[PDB]
Amino acid sequence: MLEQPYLDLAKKVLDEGHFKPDRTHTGTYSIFGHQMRFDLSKGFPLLTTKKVPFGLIKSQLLWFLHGDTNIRFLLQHRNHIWDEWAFEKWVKSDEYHGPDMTDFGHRSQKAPEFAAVYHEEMAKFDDRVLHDDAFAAKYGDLGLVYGSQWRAWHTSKGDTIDQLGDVIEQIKTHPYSRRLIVSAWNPEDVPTMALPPCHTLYQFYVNDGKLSLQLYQRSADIFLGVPFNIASYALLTHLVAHECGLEVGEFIHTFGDAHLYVNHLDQIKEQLSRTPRPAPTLQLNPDKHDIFDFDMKDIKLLNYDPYPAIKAPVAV
Amino acid sequence: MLEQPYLDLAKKVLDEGHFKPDRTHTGTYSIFGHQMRFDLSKGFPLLTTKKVPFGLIKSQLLWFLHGDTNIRFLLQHRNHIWDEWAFEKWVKSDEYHGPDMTDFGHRSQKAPEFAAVYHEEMAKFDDRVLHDDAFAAKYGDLGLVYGSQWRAWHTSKGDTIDQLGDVIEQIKTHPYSRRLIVSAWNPEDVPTMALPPCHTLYQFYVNDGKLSLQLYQRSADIFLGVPFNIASYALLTHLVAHECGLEVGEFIHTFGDAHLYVNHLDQIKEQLSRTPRPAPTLQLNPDKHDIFDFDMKDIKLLNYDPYPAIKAPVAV
Numbered sequence A, B: 001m002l003e004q005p006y007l008d009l010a011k012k013v014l015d016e017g018h019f020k021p022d023r024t025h026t027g028t029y030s031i032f033g034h035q036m037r038f039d040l041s042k043g044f045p046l047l048t049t050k051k052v053p054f055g056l057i058k059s060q061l062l063w064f065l066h067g068d069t070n071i072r073f074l075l076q077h078r079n080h081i082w083d084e085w086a087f088e089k090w091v092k093s094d095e096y097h098g099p100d101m102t103d104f105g106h107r108s109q110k111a112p113e114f115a116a117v118y119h120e121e122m123a124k125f126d127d128r129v130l131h132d133d134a135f136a137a138k139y140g141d142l143g144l145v146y147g148s149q150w151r152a153w154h155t156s157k158g159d160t161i162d163q164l165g166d167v168i169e170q171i172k173t174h175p176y177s178r179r180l181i182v183s184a185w186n187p188e189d190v191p192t193m194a195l196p197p198c199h200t201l202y203q204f205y206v207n208d209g210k211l212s213l214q215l216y217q218r219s220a221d222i223f224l225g226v227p228f229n230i231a232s233y234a235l236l237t238h239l240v241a242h243e244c245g246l247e248v249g250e251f252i253h254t255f256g257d258a259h260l261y262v263n264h265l266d267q268i269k270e271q272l273s274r275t276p277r278p279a280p281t282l283q284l285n286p287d288k289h290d291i292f293d294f295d296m297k298d299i300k301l302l303n304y305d306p307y308p309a310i311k312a313p314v315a316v
Ligand SMILES: C#CCN(Cc1ccc2[nH]c(N)nc(=O)c2c1)c1ccc(C(=O)N[C@@H](CCC(=O)O)C(=O)O)cc1
Pocket: A080, A081, A082, A221, A224, A225, A226, A261, A311, A312, A313, A314, A315, A316
């Protein structure tokens, strides 16, 4: 079945896992080291044992897949996953001056009155962004995010290398090469960023005509973060092979610290009260080949019958 | 037993492996994706089923572990593993002008007369290096090799980040962090190098006082290259914990393309005619703490009873 992978990763953590403090409060139960593997020939591992929502996953990928470091496309696609860091880079400073708000969010996962401000002054924020190009360009252009990492490596001699572009042009001409990597971890930049890229390195592979991919994710939350991650990189592979004219092999997903949060383990146990159903299947439009173009009307997920969605608290 | 890992990786390739052309002639049998794991508490995985030689492994590590991009320390330590690329960057050019030699080596693994030249003009090379500082500094300073990758990241704003230094100072103060990485893959530099770093990324981990490490190696030869690699990173971990005052956890070693060469598979089958013996145990001197200092008289391997060494041809 395609998603038993997750359920044996998540099972093995609350069984083998050993406790660690984190970079917040809530403890983690962590394993270090896992290869999880999915056979893309017969699927698209979006969890049938918990609604996970393909729409925000597509948007986010597509944002990444064509330069963007600016949340104004994400906002205007009803997606707000990367919304708050834009507010941290602003609540703090010199145009804004308003509410209490310096530090919000965690103290809004359980708040005071906070909800009508963290939700209403960072409403006004995300609004001005979508309509004020000036404002968009500043407090909504996040800088360094996977988008500028894959498509824009800033180099010691002035300019930017579009790495993923180059690896999709190697996939075509030179298929069998052991070099087919996109790193997202740049040292000049990591004694700095809010989050360093959690999705560090991913190499690709052809062999027999179908493209595998492997992703080393350095820090992974078992419950909330790992559902989107399997699916995104699975969506990213389906898209590279429709470009490079290849079939689908594997999506292999490796880990450093796969960790569960102690504040959401009653909830993972409830997910294991469910048996996986038949796995869903994606569609990508034939009339669009340069993967760089896809809108939402170019990737269709079909026949996803999920079990009810299970809620958990971003403490980060 | 600690090295059955290798023998089930190497077994699984000539069994599951599927054929691929490479960046040379000789075909490969390759798997893509493996986590291999060793429990350093009870060992030091140097193969007992084939002599592998700790001396050249120590030298090479130590070279790496204190700035060097120059083979004059490697030469003067009777090690010549990185010797020939120094000769390719020279056979080719303007001080040298001598023998036929432009392209040598492969055509010396099976040569014409080649042996008394590839071996005698690149004798004269490695000699002048060890005695002529001028010459050392040029045709023996390899530039970018793991040494300048770990200890010298060249940055867009002028200077060099000593990454490994910084990660050993984080290991001390902040132990439990999901950030403890040293990448060796720099994009500005990889549309270029002879070999891109085969040992791309490695993150570390404490938890309960003993340090694990995990290495994603992008391209690995099963037979010749993978023996040194398990041991080096195992030696590298033993050294970080004696610095950071930690015990030893695991050494986890992940793969992209683990591949065997078709020209050395009679030879791997002969290694599997042997049962592993008791695994060897290393020593690191108590009076030397800054790992940055170790000479050869600071790491002792004890009680390594190996099976005879099994020879195989560098075609690259
Ligand atoms: C990328 C990026 C930046 N971020 C920020 C961020 C903050 C805390 C985190 N916490 C955990 N455990 N994992 C994460 O991936 C994570 C990411 C993201 C923002 C939201 C979601 C997300 O949709 N969360 C839940 C929604 C339910 C809820 O909390 O109310 C989900 O659908 O699973 C994922 C990533």
